[PDB]
Amino acid sequence: EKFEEKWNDILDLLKHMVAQKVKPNLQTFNTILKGLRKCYSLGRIPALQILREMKHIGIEPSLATYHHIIHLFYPRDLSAIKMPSLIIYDIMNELEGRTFSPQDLDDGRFFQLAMSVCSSLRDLELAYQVHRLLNTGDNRKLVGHDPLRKVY
Amino acid sequence: YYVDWRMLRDLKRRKMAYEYADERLRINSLRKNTILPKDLQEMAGDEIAALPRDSCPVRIRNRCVMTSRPRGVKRRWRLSRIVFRHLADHGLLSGVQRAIW
């Protein structure tokens, strides 16, 4: 019923992960962010904090981890198109030239979602950056499956 | 089904010779020398005789694998002259041509 209680509960599981000397993995953070996509409005500040904590621990954000942050910051059913967020530009700068490997089950989703946000923003320069990232190394393998390859 | 009952008998002769190859080698070695007592050699002459007749490898005949023809076979292809000519005259053997010179 209450998000604040719900969030404090999920955090309690994380606190018991340190009491029992259990270290988190990529999936642990990806799971929390995938859950946060329900509360688009209130999950923005929590979502950024997780990614900062991911780097400090030493877990490397994968394409799936950004796929969730994008969904949370650029809603498809977004009425407020007047002043969209600028995070997508920073993410692409962060991932410029990097090569990625399969490390989660939502890695394919990232590329299809990134182009959609570009079409919504009508920024063709960003679309070239996203496509340029797809061509580096063997990133082409994470474009998506039959449903998402033709959408991208 | 094999081509005929003659090819079937030949196939069994080939599989019983493989079973008795080491045995017939070890026993026959005791006979093909002049270093062992003749009493042992006379007895080894009968142990080899007692083995089944189809274990003997000289009862194998090379037959065309496709027509089971006993004579006329070419050992490199295992085919009779008649079957070989049919494949050769149709361009189906790799590198076989007619000899003109």
């Binding site: 496509h131 061509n135 190394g137 063997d138 | 008649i82 070989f84 000519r85 790799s94 590198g95 000899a99």
Partner: protein, 140 residues
Amino acid sequence: LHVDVPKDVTRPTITTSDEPDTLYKRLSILVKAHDRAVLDSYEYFAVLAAKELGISIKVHEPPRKIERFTLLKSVHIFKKHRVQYEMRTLYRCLELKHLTGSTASVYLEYIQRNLPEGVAMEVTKTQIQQLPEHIKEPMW
């Protein structure tokens, strides 16, 4: 591709070991085929590949072999009437010189993977190594 080009193509990892490399004084590659033209095309591909990697190569044509045999033309009798068949083997020898073991593996893979159908190779590597350490010093 006119506008869409790979950016940073991934290349295999080649790690230099600490073991010393083999030294091949000579490396003779005898290709065989029923067709002379295929050997000519393979000779051009192999000589071009060697020259591009820095390898020293020479080529000659060992004498061809023709194997002929006779058969009976008819299915029954008519002994005097026969049919003769032949198989022709042609050779091209690619003699390479002064190759390290890393250069000979990459070259042989590249040319063996591109060996046409109906072509047989016979590599004859000639390695050069020092004397055994025991043999170096006479010990009674």
